[PDB]
Each structure stands twice: as structure tokens, then as C-alpha cells.
Design a protein around this motif. Structure first.
Motif, PDB file in Angstrom:
ATOM      1  N   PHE A   1      20.843   3.878  22.180  1.00 55.53           N
ATOM      2  CA  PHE A   1      20.230   4.688  21.140  1.00 55.53           C
ATOM      3  C   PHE A   1      18.714   4.599  21.216  1.00 55.53           C
ATOM      4  CE2 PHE A   1      21.384   0.587  19.396  1.00 55.53           C
ATOM      5  CZ  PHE A   1      20.192   0.138  18.881  1.00 55.53           C
ATOM      6  N   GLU A   2      18.069   5.541  20.539  1.00 55.85           N
ATOM      7  CA  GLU A   2      16.625   5.609  20.385  1.00 55.85           C
ATOM      8  C   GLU A   2      16.263   5.422  18.918  1.00 55.85           C
ATOM      9  OE1 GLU A   2      14.338   9.066  21.977  1.00 55.85           O
ATOM     10  OE2 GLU A   2      14.323   9.698  19.876  1.00 55.85           O
ATOM     11  N   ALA A   3      15.174   4.704  18.666  1.00 53.79           N
ATOM     12  CA  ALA A   3      14.856   4.265  17.318  1.00 53.79           C
ATOM     13  C   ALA A   3      13.574   4.902  16.810  1.00 53.79           C
ATOM     14  CB  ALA A   3      14.719   2.744  17.247  1.00 53.79           C
ATOM     15  N   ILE A   4      13.592   5.259  15.530  1.00 52.72           N
ATOM     16  CA  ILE A   4      12.402   5.622  14.774  1.00 52.72           C
ATOM     17  C   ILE A   4      12.284   4.644  13.618  1.00 52.72           C
ATOM     18  CG2 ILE A   4      11.360   7.329  13.256  1.00 52.72           C
ATOM     19  CD1 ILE A   4      12.652   9.484  14.977  1.00 52.72           C
ATOM     20  N   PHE A   5      11.155   3.946  13.537  1.00 56.46           N
ATOM     21  CA  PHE A   5      10.935   3.039  12.422  1.00 56.46           C
ATOM     22  C   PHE A   5       9.514   3.220  11.885  1.00 56.46           C
ATOM     23  CE2 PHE A   5      11.838   0.572  16.381  1.00 56.46           C
ATOM     24  CZ  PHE A   5      10.579   0.647  16.919  1.00 56.46           C
ATOM     25  N   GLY A   6       9.092   4.474  11.761  1.00 52.93           N
ATOM     26  CA  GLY A   6       7.852   4.765  11.071  1.00 52.93           C
ATOM     27  C   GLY A   6       7.536   6.232  10.875  1.00 52.93           C
ATOM     28  N   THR A   7       7.197   6.610   9.645  1.00 52.01           N
ATOM     29  CA  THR A   7       6.566   7.890   9.354  1.00 52.01           C
ATOM     30  C   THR A   7       5.421   7.625   8.392  1.00 52.01           C
ATOM     31  OG1 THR A   7       8.092   8.371   7.535  1.00 52.01           O
ATOM     32  CG2 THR A   7       8.674   9.215   9.718  1.00 52.01           C
ATOM     33  N   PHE A   8       4.244   8.164   8.696  1.00 48.65           N
ATOM     34  CA  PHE A   8       3.037   7.799   7.975  1.00 48.65           C
ATOM     35  C   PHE A   8       2.204   9.028   7.651  1.00 48.65           C
ATOM     36  CE2 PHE A   8       4.137   4.153  10.623  1.00 48.65           C
ATOM     37  CZ  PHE A   8       4.276   3.189   9.657  1.00 48.65           C
ATOM     38  N   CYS A   9       1.489   8.949   6.534  1.00 46.42           N
ATOM     39  CA  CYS A   9       0.640  10.027   6.059  1.00 46.42           C
ATOM     40  C   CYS A   9      -0.751   9.476   5.788  1.00 46.42           C
ATOM     41  CB  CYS A   9       1.216  10.670   4.793  1.00 46.42           C
ATOM     42  SG  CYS A   9       0.523  12.287   4.386  1.00 46.42           S
ATOM     43  N   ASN A  10      -1.745  10.351   5.872  1.00 47.22           N
ATOM     44  CA  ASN A  10      -3.142   9.968   5.723  1.00 47.22           C
ATOM     45  C   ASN A  10      -3.532  10.058   4.254  1.00 47.22           C
ATOM     46  OD1 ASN A  10      -5.946   9.464   6.298  1.00 47.22           O
ATOM     47  ND2 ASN A  10      -6.267  11.678   6.168  1.00 47.22           N
ATOM     48  N   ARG A  11      -4.023   8.950   3.705  1.00 43.33           N
ATOM     49  CA  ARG A  11      -4.366   8.848   2.287  1.00 43.33           C
ATOM     50  C   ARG A  11      -5.820   9.261   2.096  1.00 43.33           C
ATOM     51  NH1 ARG A  11      -3.001   3.215   0.460  1.00 43.33           N
ATOM     52  NH2 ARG A  11      -5.210   2.759   0.845  1.00 43.33           N
ATOM     53  N   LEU A  12      -6.017  10.478   1.599  1.00 47.52           N
ATOM     54  CA  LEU A  12      -7.362  11.014   1.433  1.00 47.52           C
ATOM     55  C   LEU A  12      -8.105  10.319   0.300  1.00 47.52           C
ATOM     56  CD1 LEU A  12      -6.662  14.794   1.990  1.00 47.52           C
ATOM     57  CD2 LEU A  12      -8.389  13.469   3.199  1.00 47.52           C
ATOM     58  N   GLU A  13      -9.431  10.280   0.417  1.00 52.94           N
ATOM     59  CA  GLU A  13     -10.316   9.762  -0.618  1.00 52.94           C
ATOM     60  C   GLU A  13     -11.122  10.913  -1.201  1.00 52.94           C
ATOM     61  OE1 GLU A  13     -12.445   6.080   0.469  1.00 52.94           O
ATOM     62  OE2 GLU A  13     -11.366   6.203   2.377  1.00 52.94           O
ATOM     63  N   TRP A  14     -11.149  11.010  -2.525  1.00 50.98           N
ATOM     64  CA  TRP A  14     -11.784  12.142  -3.177  1.00 50.98           C
ATOM     65  C   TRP A  14     -13.265  11.887  -3.423  1.00 50.98           C
ATOM     66  CZ3 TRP A  14      -8.208  15.031  -1.888  1.00 50.98           C
ATOM     67  CH2 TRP A  14      -6.865  14.719  -2.096  1.00 50.98           C
ATOM     68  N   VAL A  15     -14.040  12.969  -3.396  1.00 50.87           N
ATOM     69  CA  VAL A  15     -15.486  12.933  -3.572  1.00 50.87           C
ATOM     70  C   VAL A  15     -15.852  13.859  -4.722  1.00 50.87           C
ATOM     71  CG1 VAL A  15     -17.688  13.560  -2.544  1.00 50.87           C
ATOM     72  CG2 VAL A  15     -16.018  12.310  -1.204  1.00 50.87           C
ATOM     73  N   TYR A  16     -16.737  13.394  -5.599  1.00 52.31           N
ATOM     74  CA  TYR A  16     -17.182  14.170  -6.746  1.00 52.31           C
ATOM     75  C   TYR A  16     -18.700  14.219  -6.778  1.00 52.31           C
ATOM     76  CZ  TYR A  16     -12.391  13.323  -8.221  1.00 52.31           C
ATOM     77  OH  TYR A  16     -11.021  13.237  -8.275  1.00 52.31           O
ATOM     78  N   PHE A  17     -19.238  15.331  -7.280  1.00 53.78           N
ATOM     79  CA  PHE A  17     -20.685  15.497  -7.326  1.00 53.78           C
ATOM     80  C   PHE A  17     -21.316  14.575  -8.360  1.00 53.78           C
ATOM     81  CE2 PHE A  17     -24.462  17.515  -9.095  1.00 53.78           C
ATOM     82  CZ  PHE A  17     -25.220  17.704  -7.966  1.00 53.78           C
ATOM     83  N   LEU A  18     -20.749  14.531  -9.568  1.00 54.61           N
ATOM     84  CA  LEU A  18     -21.367  13.772 -10.648  1.00 54.61           C
ATOM     85  C   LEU A  18     -21.360  12.272 -10.397  1.00 54.61           C
ATOM     86  CD1 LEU A  18     -20.182  15.625 -13.848  1.00 54.61           C
ATOM     87  CD2 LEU A  18     -22.468  15.539 -12.868  1.00 54.61           C
ATOM     88  N   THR A  19     -20.412  11.764  -9.622  1.00 54.71           N
ATOM     89  CA  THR A  19     -20.345  10.337  -9.345  1.00 54.71           C
ATOM     90  C   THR A  19     -21.204   9.925  -8.160  1.00 54.71           C
ATOM     91  OG1 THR A  19     -18.463  10.408  -7.828  1.00 54.71           O
ATOM     92  CG2 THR A  19     -17.999  10.456 -10.186  1.00 54.71           C
ATOM     93  N   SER A  20     -21.898  10.862  -7.529  1.00 54.43           N
ATOM     94  CA  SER A  20     -22.751  10.532  -6.404  1.00 54.43           C
ATOM     95  C   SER A  20     -24.150  10.163  -6.882  1.00 54.43           C
ATOM     96  CB  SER A  20     -22.824  11.700  -5.427  1.00 54.43           C
ATOM     97  OG  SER A  20     -23.561  12.772  -5.983  1.00 54.43           O
ATOM     98  N   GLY A  21     -24.858   9.408  -6.043  1.00 59.67           N
ATOM     99  CA  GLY A  21     -26.223   9.044  -6.369  1.00 59.67           C
ATOM    100  C   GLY A  21     -27.188  10.200  -6.232  1.00 59.67           C
ATOM    101  N   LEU A  22     -26.877  11.152  -5.352  1.00 64.88           N
ATOM    102  CA  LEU A  22     -27.737  12.315  -5.176  1.00 64.88           C
ATOM    103  C   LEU A  22     -27.866  13.106  -6.470  1.00 64.88           C
ATOM    104  CD1 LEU A  22     -29.244  14.023  -2.915  1.00 64.88           C
ATOM    105  CD2 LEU A  22     -27.177  15.413  -2.880  1.00 64.88           C
ATOM    106  N   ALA A  23     -26.836  13.057  -7.316  1.00 64.16           N
ATOM    107  CA  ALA A  23     -26.834  13.843  -8.544  1.00 64.16           C
ATOM    108  C   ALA A  23     -27.964  13.446  -9.482  1.00 64.16           C
ATOM    109  CB  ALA A  23     -25.488  13.702  -9.248  1.00 64.16           C
TER     110      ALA A  23
END
Lengths: 49, 49
Positions: A1-23
Motif C-alpha cells: 500500500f501507499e500512505a498519506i499522513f498529511g494535509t496542510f493549509c497556510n495560516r494567513l496573518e491579517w493586516v490592518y491600517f489603523l493598527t500599523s505605525g504608519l497610521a
């Protein structure tokens, strides 16, 4: 037999204008778009010592 | 204190106090809203004309 022991997704990080220092350089306001005829005329009389 | 004070001269001319408590109370609540909208809520720093 052939085995699969992983499925993975990319966990995005959110960005906001008001929480930035440039604001800090901004004065951000939300307003209606009431068709102000290219309101490029802000005229100022500023007192000079 | 100051070299010479202009505040001494306003009452002689006929211009009362700082306008802060005066125009608010002398408005009868009718001139007060007109001042807030068409003039400004903080005459120091800035004012619209």
C-alpha cells in the motif's frame, strides 16, 4: 500500500491600517462621496508672527 | 506678565471677554448652533470663513 499522513493549509496573518505605525502620520476619516466637483480648493489664511 | 496687554483694550473698544462663555450664553441657543456649524466649535487654532 501507499500512505498519506498529511494535509496542510497556510495560516494567513491579517493586516490592518489603523493598527500599523504608519497610521500615526495620518488623520483618517470615513465620509460620504457626495460628488464634490474636484474639491481641490482648500484656502487657508494662516497668521504669521 | 506681558510687555503690554491688548486685553485691556477690548472692553474699552466694546468687544466683550473671550467669546467663550459669552457667545454661547448670549445666543439664546439659536446663534449657538449657527456658530457651531458655520464658524467652528474651537475658535482658537482654527476657524472657518
Amino acid at each position: 500500500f501507499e500512505a498519506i499522513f498529511g494535509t496542510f493549509c497556510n495560516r494567513l496573518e491579517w493586516v490592518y491600517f489603523l493598527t500599523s505605525g504608519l497610521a500615526a502620520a495620518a488623520h483618517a476619516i470615513k465620509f460620504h462621496d457626495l460628488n464634490k466637483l474636484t474639491t481641490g480648493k482648500m484656502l487657508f489664511h494662516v497668521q504669521v508672527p | 506678565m506681558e510687555n503690554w496687554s491688548a486685553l485691556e483694550l477690548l472692553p474699552k473698544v466694546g468687544i466683550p471677554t473671550d467669546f467663550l462663555t459669552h457667545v454661547k450664553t448670549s445666543a439664546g441657543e439659536e446663534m449657538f448652533e449657527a456658530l457651531r456649524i458655520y464658524y467652528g466649535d474651537d475658535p482658537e487654532r482654527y476657524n472657518i470663513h
